[PDB]
Coordinates of C-alpha atoms in Angstrom, one line a residue:
Chain A
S1 CA 186.2 270.7 211.4
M2 CA 184.3 272.9 213.6
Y3 CA 184.3 270.6 217.1
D4 CA 187.8 269.1 217.3
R5 CA 188.1 271.5 220.1
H6 CA 184.5 271.0 221.5
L7 CA 185.0 266.8 221.4
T8 CA 187.5 264.5 222.8
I9 CA 188.9 263.8 218.9
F10 CA 192.1 264.6 217.3
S11 CA 192.9 268.3 215.9
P12 CA 194.3 268.1 212.7
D13 CA 197.8 268.7 214.3
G14 CA 197.4 265.5 216.7
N15 CA 196.2 266.9 219.6
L16 CA 193.4 266.6 221.9
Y17 CA 192.5 270.0 222.9
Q18 CA 189.5 269.3 225.8
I19 CA 192.1 267.6 227.9
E20 CA 194.5 270.5 227.6
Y21 CA 191.9 273.1 228.5
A22 CA 191.0 270.5 231.7
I23 CA 194.4 271.3 232.5
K24 CA 194.5 274.4 232.3
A25 CA 191.2 274.5 234.5
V26 CA 192.8 272.4 237.1
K27 CA 195.5 275.1 237.1
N28 CA 193.2 278.1 237.6
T29 CA 192.2 276.7 241.3
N30 CA 194.8 278.9 242.4
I31 CA 195.2 275.5 244.8
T32 CA 199.1 274.4 245.7
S33 CA 200.2 271.1 246.7
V34 CA 202.8 269.6 247.6
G35 CA 204.2 266.3 248.4
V36 CA 207.9 265.2 249.6
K37 CA 208.7 261.6 250.0
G38 CA 211.7 260.7 252.4
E39 CA 213.4 257.7 253.5
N40 CA 210.5 255.8 255.5
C41 CA 207.8 258.3 255.3
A42 CA 206.1 261.0 252.9
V43 CA 203.9 263.9 253.6
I44 CA 201.9 265.4 251.6
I45 CA 201.1 269.5 252.3
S46 CA 198.0 272.1 251.4
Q47 CA 196.8 274.6 251.3
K48 CA 193.3 274.9 253.4
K49 CA 192.3 277.4 250.8
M50 CA 189.0 277.6 248.2
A51 CA 189.6 276.7 245.2
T52 CA 188.9 280.0 243.4
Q53 CA 185.4 279.7 241.4
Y54 CA 182.3 281.7 241.2
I55 CA 181.8 281.9 244.8
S56 CA 184.2 284.3 246.9
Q57 CA 185.4 283.4 250.5
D58 CA 182.4 284.4 253.2
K59 CA 183.2 286.0 256.8
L60 CA 180.9 283.0 258.0
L61 CA 182.3 280.2 256.2
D62 CA 183.4 277.8 258.2
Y63 CA 187.5 277.2 257.4
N64 CA 188.2 274.4 259.0
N65 CA 186.3 272.5 256.6
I66 CA 187.9 273.6 253.6
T67 CA 190.6 271.2 253.2
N68 CA 192.4 269.5 249.9
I69 CA 193.1 266.7 251.8
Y70 CA 191.8 263.4 252.3
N71 CA 192.1 259.7 253.4
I72 CA 191.0 256.9 250.9
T73 CA 191.9 254.4 253.3
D74 CA 193.2 254.3 256.6
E75 CA 196.7 253.9 255.1
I76 CA 196.3 255.4 252.3
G77 CA 195.9 259.4 251.4
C78 CA 195.5 261.8 249.1
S79 CA 195.8 265.6 247.9
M80 CA 193.1 266.6 245.1
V81 CA 193.2 269.8 243.5
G82 CA 190.5 271.0 240.8
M83 CA 187.1 271.9 240.6
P84 CA 185.5 270.8 244.0
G85 CA 182.7 269.0 242.4
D86 CA 185.3 266.8 240.4
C87 CA 187.7 266.3 243.7
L88 CA 184.6 265.1 245.9
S89 CA 184.0 262.8 242.8
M90 CA 187.2 261.3 242.4
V91 CA 187.9 261.1 245.9
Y92 CA 185.1 258.6 245.7
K93 CA 185.9 256.9 243.2
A94 CA 189.2 256.1 244.6
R95 CA 187.4 254.7 247.6
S96 CA 185.3 252.6 246.0
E97 CA 188.3 251.4 244.1
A98 CA 190.3 250.6 247.1
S99 CA 187.0 249.1 248.9
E100 CA 186.8 246.8 245.8
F101 CA 190.5 245.9 245.5
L102 CA 190.5 244.9 249.2
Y103 CA 187.1 242.8 248.7
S104 CA 188.4 240.8 245.8
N105 CA 192.7 240.1 246.7
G106 CA 192.3 239.6 250.3
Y107 CA 194.8 242.6 251.4
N108 CA 194.9 246.7 251.1
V109 CA 195.7 248.2 247.7
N110 CA 199.0 250.3 247.7
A111 CA 199.3 253.4 246.4
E112 CA 200.9 252.9 242.9
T113 CA 198.3 250.4 241.9
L114 CA 195.5 253.1 243.0
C115 CA 196.7 255.6 240.9
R116 CA 197.2 253.6 237.9
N117 CA 193.1 252.3 238.4
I118 CA 192.9 255.4 238.7
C119 CA 194.7 256.5 235.7
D120 CA 192.6 253.7 233.5
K121 CA 188.8 255.2 234.4
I122 CA 190.2 258.2 233.2
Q123 CA 191.5 257.4 229.9
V124 CA 187.7 256.7 229.5
Chain B
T1 CA 166.9 198.7 267.9
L2 CA 166.4 200.8 265.2
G3 CA 169.8 202.7 265.0
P4 CA 172.4 203.9 268.2
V5 CA 171.3 206.8 270.6
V6 CA 174.0 205.6 273.6
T7 CA 177.0 205.3 272.0
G8 CA 180.8 204.5 273.0
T9 CA 183.5 205.6 270.7
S10 CA 186.4 203.3 269.1
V11 CA 188.4 200.6 271.0
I12 CA 191.7 199.4 270.3
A13 CA 193.4 195.7 271.5
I14 CA 197.1 194.8 270.4
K15 CA 199.2 191.5 271.3
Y16 CA 202.3 192.1 273.9
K17 CA 205.0 189.5 274.9
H18 CA 203.0 189.2 278.0
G19 CA 199.1 188.8 276.5
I20 CA 196.2 191.0 275.3
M21 CA 196.5 194.8 276.3
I22 CA 193.1 196.7 275.6
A23 CA 192.1 199.9 275.8
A24 CA 188.7 202.2 275.6
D25 CA 187.9 206.2 276.8
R26 CA 185.2 205.6 279.8
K27 CA 182.8 208.3 277.7
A28 CA 179.2 206.9 276.3
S29 CA 177.7 209.9 273.9
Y30 CA 173.8 210.7 273.3
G31 CA 174.7 212.3 270.4
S32 CA 176.8 215.3 270.6
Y33 CA 176.2 215.4 274.7
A34 CA 178.7 213.5 276.5
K35 CA 176.1 212.4 279.3
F36 CA 177.9 209.8 280.6
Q37 CA 181.7 210.7 281.3
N38 CA 182.5 207.0 283.4
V39 CA 181.3 204.5 281.8
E40 CA 182.8 201.0 281.4
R41 CA 183.2 199.3 278.1
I42 CA 185.2 196.2 278.5
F43 CA 183.8 193.5 280.4
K44 CA 185.4 190.2 281.4
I45 CA 183.6 187.2 280.0
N46 CA 186.3 184.8 281.9
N47 CA 189.7 184.6 282.8
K48 CA 191.2 184.6 280.0
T49 CA 188.4 186.7 277.6
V50 CA 187.6 190.3 277.7
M51 CA 184.9 191.7 275.4
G52 CA 185.5 195.8 274.0
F53 CA 182.6 197.6 272.4
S54 CA 181.6 200.5 270.1
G55 CA 178.5 201.7 269.2
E56 CA 174.9 201.3 271.2
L57 CA 175.2 200.7 274.7
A58 CA 172.0 198.8 275.3
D59 CA 173.1 196.6 272.5
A60 CA 176.5 195.8 274.1
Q61 CA 174.7 195.0 277.3
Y62 CA 172.2 192.4 275.8
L63 CA 176.0 191.0 274.7
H64 CA 177.2 191.1 277.7
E65 CA 174.4 189.6 279.7
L66 CA 174.4 186.7 276.7
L67 CA 178.0 185.9 277.4
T68 CA 178.1 186.4 281.4
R69 CA 175.3 183.6 281.3
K70 CA 177.5 181.5 278.6
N71 CA 180.8 181.7 281.0
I72 CA 178.3 180.9 284.2
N73 CA 177.1 177.9 282.3
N74 CA 180.6 176.8 281.2
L75 CA 181.6 177.1 284.6
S76 CA 178.6 175.2 285.8
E77 CA 179.9 172.3 283.6
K78 CA 183.5 172.5 284.4
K79 CA 185.4 169.4 285.6
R80 CA 188.8 170.5 284.5
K81 CA 190.6 173.6 283.5
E82 CA 190.7 172.6 279.7
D83 CA 187.0 173.1 279.6
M84 CA 187.0 176.3 280.0
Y85 CA 185.5 178.3 276.7
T86 CA 188.4 180.2 274.7
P87 CA 188.6 183.6 273.1
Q88 CA 187.9 182.0 269.4
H89 CA 184.6 179.9 270.8
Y90 CA 183.7 183.0 272.4
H91 CA 184.2 184.9 268.8
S92 CA 182.6 182.4 267.0
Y93 CA 179.7 182.6 269.0
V94 CA 179.5 186.7 268.9
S95 CA 180.1 185.8 265.4
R96 CA 176.8 183.5 265.1
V97 CA 174.8 185.6 266.8
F98 CA 175.8 189.0 264.4
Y99 CA 175.1 186.8 261.2
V100 CA 171.8 185.6 262.4
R101 CA 170.6 188.7 263.3
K102 CA 171.5 190.3 259.8
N103 CA 169.6 188.1 258.2
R104 CA 166.5 188.8 260.5
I105 CA 167.4 192.5 259.7
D106 CA 167.3 193.3 263.3
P107 CA 171.3 193.5 264.3
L108 CA 172.8 195.1 267.0
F109 CA 174.1 198.5 266.4
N110 CA 178.1 196.9 267.4
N111 CA 181.4 196.4 266.5
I112 CA 183.3 194.2 268.8
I113 CA 186.7 193.3 269.5
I114 CA 186.9 189.8 271.3
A115 CA 190.3 189.3 272.6
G116 CA 192.2 186.7 275.4
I117 CA 194.3 183.9 276.0
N118 CA 194.0 180.9 273.8
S119 CA 195.5 178.3 276.1
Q120 CA 195.7 176.6 279.5
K121 CA 199.3 176.5 279.8
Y122 CA 200.4 179.2 281.0
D123 CA 198.6 179.0 284.7
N124 CA 196.5 177.6 286.8
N125 CA 194.0 180.4 286.9
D126 CA 191.0 178.4 285.6
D127 CA 191.6 175.3 288.5
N128 CA 189.6 177.1 291.1
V129 CA 187.3 180.1 289.8
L130 CA 186.4 183.0 291.8
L131 CA 183.5 185.1 289.8
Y132 CA 182.9 187.4 292.9
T133 CA 186.2 188.1 294.6
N134 CA 189.2 189.2 292.3
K135 CA 191.8 187.8 294.7
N136 CA 194.8 190.1 292.6
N137 CA 193.9 193.0 293.9
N138 CA 201.5 188.3 296.2
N139 CA 202.8 189.5 292.7
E140 CA 204.7 187.0 290.4
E141 CA 206.4 187.6 287.2
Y142 CA 204.3 187.5 284.2
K143 CA 204.5 184.8 281.9
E144 CA 206.2 185.1 278.8
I145 CA 203.0 184.0 276.1
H146 CA 203.8 183.2 272.5
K147 CA 201.7 185.5 270.6
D148 CA 200.5 182.3 268.2
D149 CA 198.3 181.4 271.9
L150 CA 196.9 184.9 272.2
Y151 CA 193.7 185.6 270.2
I152 CA 191.8 189.1 269.2
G153 CA 189.1 189.1 267.1
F154 CA 186.6 191.3 265.2
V155 CA 182.8 190.8 264.5
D156 CA 181.2 194.2 263.4
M157 CA 177.3 194.8 261.8
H158 CA 177.5 192.8 259.4
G159 CA 178.8 189.3 260.6
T160 CA 181.8 190.3 259.2
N161 CA 184.7 188.6 261.5
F162 CA 188.1 188.5 261.5
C163 CA 191.3 188.0 263.6
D164 CA 195.0 189.5 264.1
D165 CA 197.8 190.9 266.2
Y166 CA 195.6 194.2 266.8
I167 CA 192.3 195.2 266.2
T168 CA 190.6 197.9 266.2
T169 CA 187.0 200.0 266.0
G170 CA 185.6 203.5 265.2
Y171 CA 187.8 206.1 264.6
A172 CA 190.6 204.6 265.5
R173 CA 190.5 202.1 262.6
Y174 CA 192.0 205.1 260.7
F175 CA 194.3 206.7 263.6
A176 CA 195.5 203.8 265.6
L177 CA 195.2 201.4 262.7
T178 CA 197.5 203.7 260.7
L179 CA 200.1 203.8 263.5
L180 CA 200.0 200.2 264.4
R181 CA 200.2 198.8 260.8
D182 CA 203.5 201.6 260.6
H183 CA 204.7 201.0 264.0
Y184 CA 203.5 197.8 266.0
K185 CA 206.1 195.0 266.2
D186 CA 206.0 191.7 268.0
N187 CA 206.7 190.9 271.4
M188 CA 206.2 194.3 272.8
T189 CA 207.0 195.1 276.8
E190 CA 203.9 196.4 279.1
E191 CA 205.8 200.3 278.8
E192 CA 206.0 199.9 274.9
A193 CA 203.0 198.9 274.4
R194 CA 201.3 201.0 276.5
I195 CA 203.2 204.2 274.5
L196 CA 201.8 202.8 271.7
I197 CA 198.2 202.6 272.6
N198 CA 198.6 206.1 274.4
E199 CA 199.8 207.9 270.9
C200 CA 196.8 206.1 269.2
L201 CA 194.6 207.5 272.4
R202 CA 195.8 211.2 272.3
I203 CA 196.0 211.2 268.2
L204 CA 191.9 210.1 268.5
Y205 CA 191.3 212.8 271.4
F206 CA 192.8 214.9 269.1
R207 CA 190.9 214.2 265.6
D208 CA 187.8 212.6 267.3
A209 CA 184.8 214.4 268.3
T210 CA 183.1 211.5 270.4
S211 CA 186.3 210.8 272.4
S212 CA 187.4 211.5 275.7
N213 CA 191.0 211.5 277.3
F214 CA 189.9 209.4 280.5
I215 CA 190.8 206.1 279.8
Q216 CA 190.6 202.8 281.0
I217 CA 193.2 200.0 280.1
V218 CA 192.9 195.9 280.2
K219 CA 195.4 193.4 280.0
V220 CA 194.6 189.8 279.8
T221 CA 197.5 187.9 281.0
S222 CA 199.3 185.1 283.2
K223 CA 197.5 186.6 286.0
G224 CA 194.3 186.7 284.6
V225 CA 192.2 189.7 283.6
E226 CA 193.3 193.1 285.2
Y227 CA 191.7 196.7 285.1
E228 CA 194.1 199.2 285.8
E229 CA 193.4 203.1 287.4
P230 CA 191.6 205.1 284.8
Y231 CA 194.1 207.9 284.0
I232 CA 193.6 211.2 282.3
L233 CA 195.6 211.5 279.3
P234 CA 198.0 214.3 279.2
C235 CA 196.9 215.7 275.6
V236 CA 199.2 219.0 275.0
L237 CA 198.6 220.9 271.4
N238 CA 201.5 220.0 269.2
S239 CA 202.1 223.5 267.6
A240 CA 202.5 227.0 268.9
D241 CA 200.4 228.2 265.7
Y242 CA 197.2 227.0 267.1
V243 CA 197.9 230.0 270.2
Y244 CA 199.0 232.1 268.1
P245 CA 197.1 235.2 269.1
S246 CA 194.6 236.4 266.0
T247 CA 195.1 240.0 266.7
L248 CA 198.8 239.6 265.6
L249 CA 197.7 238.0 262.1
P250 CA 196.9 240.7 259.4
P251 CA 193.5 242.6 259.6
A252 CA 192.9 241.8 256.5
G253 CA 191.8 238.9 254.6
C254 CA 190.5 235.6 255.5
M255 CA 193.2 235.0 257.7
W256 CA 191.3 233.0 260.9

């Protein structure tokens, strides 16, 4: 048709090109994050760099505020890479998910469950 | 009396090898306010009979005065020890009083225990009755009194009345009554009876908001009616999970 790449509808080969374009948009930010897992610890390292976008890095920009790492709860953390507005939106969604889980179930969500709930939201 | 204002909590009476053991805490509550902490809730009618009450203190005092004057008249007319009224006689009197007041719908807000010795063949205490001097307060052995010669009777607000080997009022009628229906046995010694009563009173102190651990024990025996020295029951909690600090429980959820 004329919109198989504009909308999230299948292309004749069975692809969803908008998802690939969103992945390319994430890749274009030129922000790198690395997560490692130890025996009893897990570490996430990221760049204190501004995702490449229409605006550039100014001399008067506060570089301590630049961060791609967030607390979802006191005991769960994340690193988000992509369009900064989308990253903030996802962080808020994850925080609200964790808080709703805590209130509803009387205990704190774990990272696996939080990630799976976020992906269930993304599927929509 | 339209209802209870100042009230006393449960009473427990049981039979044991030497007579009657009756216990009550010395507390009268004006609602949730423990206003009076040294109240007497067991009264001596004569040398072989005691009365315990749970409910309105004013109605209990009215009944106590009635029984005191009944005993005085009995003593005035007495010629031999056999003429003294028995616990059964006093129980019948109190039951009739309660029945008539029920018929008038002017009840006494009380549950009454009338306990004592239903016999004159174990002592000569009623040969010469002293009302204003207690010679007991010179120690001879107690007499093993037959269970059938003892008497404990219960009267309630509607005039329902009966007798048994042990009687309870108030919340004792649940806690102490369960413990007694399990563990009571005939011809218990004084120490065993006291231990059973102390267990019952401890459970009452833990689970009843209107009780105290300041306990009055009264023994009706061949020596007569003896009031023990009131004592504080030691009541310690039976679990360390109670004492466990709350901050050591998980901070998430309804851990309280």
